[PDB]
Amino acid sequence: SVSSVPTKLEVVAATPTSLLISWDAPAVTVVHYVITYGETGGNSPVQEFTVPGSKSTATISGLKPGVDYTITVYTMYYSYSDLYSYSSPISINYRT
Amino acid sequence: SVSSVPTKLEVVAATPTSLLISWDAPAVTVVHYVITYGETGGNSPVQEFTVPGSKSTATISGLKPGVDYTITVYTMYYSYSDLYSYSSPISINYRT
Amino acid sequence: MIKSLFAVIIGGSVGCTLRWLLSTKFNSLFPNLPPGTLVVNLLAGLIIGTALAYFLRQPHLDPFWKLMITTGLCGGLSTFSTFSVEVFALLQAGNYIWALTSVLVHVIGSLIMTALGFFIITILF
């Protein structure tokens, strides 16, 4: 009855080509966070990368200036009941 | 199944009033050895004492000169199947 | 030694199911060191320490119950594999301070629950 999804995802610092995101870690043992980001406009390949579980911030670069991106985040965590499983995602939109 | 009883119980050095006995340890985690000594003719209080498992020799003292004594030694050992338990004894007789 | 086998199953089943119920209800409460897997290990440690100093005083008990309690219950109740994943996970997550702490508490606590159960019964008697 304990959620593995992160909470309070927001952009704390931004540049024209990079977003800085922050999240509240779940009350689980997170092995790593998987960040996914893609241009909110249709068929721009969604790109993804991971962040260690001990961190709760991440940088995203290579973005075009003035574009709305969809930033989503989930976890690969350990629980007694499931071992290594992936959590549901938490998404936000931020426009550079 | 391995035996838990010592072997080669014997007086290695005697005086009139003391016996240096020794034995060989069984192939079991022996917590401590118990030595019992009394006058062979069932006419005297039987005395017992303990010696650490890390020792395989004991001293019997206060003996009467020229008297036959029955000396026996058993173990209190750990085995997987019986946890703690006492071994059957190994007895010898010796005249001081 | 088929009668011997039922002792392992009955005892273990209890110890397992017991371990299973406790871990689901309580493990999530404190993840840096799940308490469910710790209580069963302390519990079995407590039990086996008592079984130690009581079996000693009862040389003629049925090899049946001794099996069902130690190998069965305590064996099935306690766990070492589930102890390893939690540490392995705290290590993959770079949570060394807790991974190391989890190792210490389990080992020492289990030996104290053993020391307790042994010396409580040695002292009652």
Add this chain to the structure above:
Amino acid sequence: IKSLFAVIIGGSVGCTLRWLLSTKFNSLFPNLPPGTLVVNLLAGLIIGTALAYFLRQPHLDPFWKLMITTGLCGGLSTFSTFSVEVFALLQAGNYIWALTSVLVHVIGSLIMTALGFFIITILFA
């Protein structure tokens, strides 16, 4: 309830294994009973490999992960027996092997879990 059978059938097999391996082998090296150890390394192995596998196949029935983890591994492994032995050695003034037994069980079981996990992880690549 269906989950209950997994823990039982799983723990039963594991406990039955831990029993047979412990009786037949423990008595050969008292300083470090090897039956109580292999079951631990073997369960530590199984759980590590189970860890990495159920990740790659994230949608398989929860029944099989339960029977293998909390059952098999939980039943196969043991902490109480590891406790008594160490406590037995500690009681016997055998501090050297009491310590060694603690290390080899932990370090080894952890190495086995990492080994189980990392093999599978390297396999899927």
